[PDB]
mmCIF file of C-alpha atoms in Angstrom:
data_model
loop_
_atom_site.group_PDB
_atom_site.id
_atom_site.type_symbol
_atom_site.label_atom_id
_atom_site.label_comp_id
_atom_site.label_asym_id
_atom_site.label_seq_id
_atom_site.Cartn_x
_atom_site.Cartn_y
_atom_site.Cartn_z
ATOM 1 C CA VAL A 2 239.302 1.427 77.118
ATOM 2 C CA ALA A 3 239.715 4.299 77.986
ATOM 3 C CA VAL A 4 240.806 5.673 81.393
ATOM 4 C CA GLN A 5 242.082 8.924 82.818
ATOM 5 C CA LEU A 6 245.724 9.362 83.734
ATOM 6 C CA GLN A 7 247.320 12.235 85.599
ATOM 7 C CA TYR A 8 250.563 12.678 87.428
ATOM 8 C CA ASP A 9 251.397 13.278 91.131
ATOM 9 C CA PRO A 10 255.082 13.774 91.635
ATOM 10 C CA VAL A 11 254.719 11.850 94.912
ATOM 11 C CA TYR A 12 255.045 8.686 92.865
ATOM 12 C CA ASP A 13 258.385 9.912 91.688
ATOM 13 C CA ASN A 14 259.436 10.214 95.364
ATOM 14 C CA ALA A 15 261.677 7.221 95.896
ATOM 15 C CA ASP A 16 261.476 7.632 99.634
ATOM 16 C CA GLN A 17 257.734 7.910 99.999
ATOM 17 C CA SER A 18 256.775 5.290 102.533
ATOM 18 C CA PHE A 19 254.285 2.610 101.755
ATOM 19 C CA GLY A 20 252.950 3.498 105.138
ATOM 20 C CA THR A 21 251.412 6.664 103.620
ATOM 21 C CA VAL A 22 249.218 4.768 101.177
ATOM 22 C CA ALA A 23 246.311 2.348 101.235
ATOM 23 C CA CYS A 24 248.625 -0.395 100.272
ATOM 24 C CA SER A 25 250.689 -0.273 103.420
ATOM 25 C CA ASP A 26 250.578 -3.252 105.720
ATOM 26 C CA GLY A 27 248.146 -6.188 105.878
ATOM 27 C CA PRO A 28 248.520 -9.140 103.518
ATOM 28 C CA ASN A 29 248.073 -7.168 100.284
ATOM 29 C CA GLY A 30 250.078 -4.163 101.319
ATOM 30 C CA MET A 31 253.420 -3.361 99.800
ATOM 31 C CA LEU A 32 255.110 -3.162 103.247
ATOM 32 C CA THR A 33 254.139 -6.766 103.875
ATOM 33 C CA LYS A 34 255.411 -7.715 100.422
ATOM 34 C CA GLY A 35 258.733 -6.279 101.497
ATOM 35 C CA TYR A 36 258.707 -2.818 100.042
ATOM 36 C CA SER A 37 259.311 -0.067 102.409
ATOM 37 C CA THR A 38 259.228 2.873 99.976
ATOM 38 C CA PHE A 39 258.054 3.587 96.486
ATOM 39 C CA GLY A 40 261.594 3.429 95.273
ATOM 40 C CA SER A 41 262.068 -0.124 96.429
ATOM 41 C CA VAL A 42 259.546 -1.307 93.842
ATOM 42 C CA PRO A 43 261.101 -2.049 90.476
ATOM 43 C CA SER A 44 258.266 -0.417 88.654
ATOM 44 C CA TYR A 45 256.428 2.796 88.444
ATOM 45 C CA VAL A 46 253.838 2.942 91.175
ATOM 46 C CA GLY A 47 250.594 4.699 91.127
ATOM 47 C CA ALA A 48 247.186 5.080 92.448
ATOM 48 C CA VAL A 49 244.434 3.245 90.642
ATOM 49 C CA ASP A 50 240.730 3.406 90.976
ATOM 50 C CA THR A 51 240.614 -0.396 91.518
ATOM 51 C CA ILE A 52 242.084 0.298 94.946
ATOM 52 C CA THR A 53 239.353 1.590 97.200
ATOM 53 C CA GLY A 54 241.001 1.378 100.561
ATOM 54 C CA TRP A 55 243.481 -0.164 102.921
ATOM 55 C CA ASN A 56 244.546 -3.742 102.180
ATOM 56 C CA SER A 57 242.692 -3.767 98.800
ATOM 57 C CA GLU A 58 242.932 -7.094 97.135
ATOM 58 C CA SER A 59 244.067 -4.945 94.166
ATOM 59 C CA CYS A 60 247.039 -3.578 96.184
ATOM 60 C CA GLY A 61 250.207 -4.472 94.402
ATOM 61 C CA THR A 62 248.555 -5.341 91.127
ATOM 62 C CA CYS A 63 250.259 -4.571 87.903
ATOM 63 C CA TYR A 64 248.782 -2.615 84.993
ATOM 64 C CA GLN A 65 250.125 -2.450 81.551
ATOM 65 C CA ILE A 66 249.131 1.079 80.449
ATOM 66 C CA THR A 67 249.279 2.448 76.911
ATOM 67 C CA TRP A 68 248.781 5.919 75.517
ATOM 68 C CA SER A 69 247.440 6.182 72.013
ATOM 69 C CA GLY A 70 249.349 9.439 71.696
ATOM 70 C CA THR A 71 252.750 7.832 71.521
ATOM 71 C CA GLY A 72 251.732 4.260 71.424
ATOM 72 C CA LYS A 73 254.080 3.763 74.374
ATOM 73 C CA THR A 74 253.457 1.336 77.163
ATOM 74 C CA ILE A 75 254.366 1.419 80.792
ATOM 75 C CA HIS A 76 253.778 -0.881 83.757
ATOM 76 C CA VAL A 77 252.359 0.560 86.940
ATOM 77 C CA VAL A 78 251.911 -1.134 90.300
ATOM 78 C CA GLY A 79 248.688 0.007 91.958
ATOM 79 C CA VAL A 80 249.535 1.055 95.513
ATOM 80 C CA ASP A 81 247.001 3.706 96.409
ATOM 81 C CA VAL A 82 243.407 4.847 95.933
ATOM 82 C CA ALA A 83 242.700 6.931 92.840
ATOM 83 C CA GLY A 84 239.311 8.525 92.316
ATOM 84 C CA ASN A 85 239.456 8.178 88.605
ATOM 85 C CA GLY A 86 241.752 6.174 86.441
ATOM 86 C CA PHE A 87 245.421 6.387 87.409
ATOM 87 C CA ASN A 88 247.604 8.883 89.151
ATOM 88 C CA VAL A 89 251.178 8.027 88.367
ATOM 89 C CA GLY A 90 254.563 9.783 88.747
ATOM 90 C CA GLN A 91 255.683 12.411 86.293
ATOM 91 C CA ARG A 92 258.426 10.129 85.131
ATOM 92 C CA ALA A 93 255.683 7.604 84.404
ATOM 93 C CA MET A 94 253.569 10.050 82.444
ATOM 94 C CA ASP A 95 256.631 11.563 80.775
ATOM 95 C CA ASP A 96 257.472 8.076 79.702
ATOM 96 C CA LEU A 97 254.000 7.510 78.268
ATOM 97 C CA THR A 98 253.927 10.907 76.513
ATOM 98 C CA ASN A 99 257.514 11.343 75.385
ATOM 99 C CA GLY A 100 258.005 14.158 77.876
ATOM 100 C CA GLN A 101 254.579 15.883 77.822
ATOM 101 C CA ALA A 102 253.532 15.062 81.309
ATOM 102 C CA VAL A 103 253.679 18.718 82.447
ATOM 103 C CA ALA A 104 252.286 20.026 79.136
ATOM 104 C CA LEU A 105 249.270 17.690 78.888
ATOM 105 C CA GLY A 106 248.576 17.147 82.631
ATOM 106 C CA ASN A 107 245.865 14.607 81.978
ATOM 107 C CA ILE A 108 245.643 12.137 79.140
ATOM 108 C CA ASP A 109 243.273 9.268 78.377
ATOM 109 C CA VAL A 110 245.044 5.922 78.320
ATOM 110 C CA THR A 111 244.231 2.281 77.918
ATOM 111 C CA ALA A 112 245.170 -0.206 80.698
ATOM 112 C CA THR A 113 245.210 -3.965 81.308
ATOM 113 C CA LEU A 114 245.747 -5.940 84.450
ATOM 114 C CA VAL A 115 248.680 -8.290 83.912
ATOM 115 C CA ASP A 116 250.767 -10.677 85.940
ATOM 116 C CA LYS A 117 252.613 -9.060 88.796
ATOM 117 C CA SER A 118 255.860 -10.306 87.203
ATOM 118 C CA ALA A 119 255.366 -7.807 84.387
ATOM 119 C CA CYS A 120 256.015 -5.109 86.957
ATOM 120 C CA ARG A 121 259.022 -7.042 88.307
ATOM 121 C CA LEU A 122 257.116 -8.107 91.396
#
């Protein structure tokens, strides 16, 4: 309660390497956890402001995120530093907003840290 969300179409890039983000290698990084690219994770991925830098203990955490606008929920795996709230893919925001990612650009959402398994990790 509540938290900014915006979209970066980088997180829709299946081939974006986990090398390019804070959550790259090291024990918490997604490379180490066996994901080479964003598309190898069975979840939307995003930056979250709980990740502050490389090898963040928050790297690879899972957020259940809800938008009061549609009441829809998505799961996002935090893999990069966000300044404020979440930056997710457009697919991820489109999901949340029933296709108003481009039109709204930023929404306020509600998010909860949940078991990794909720993001299929």
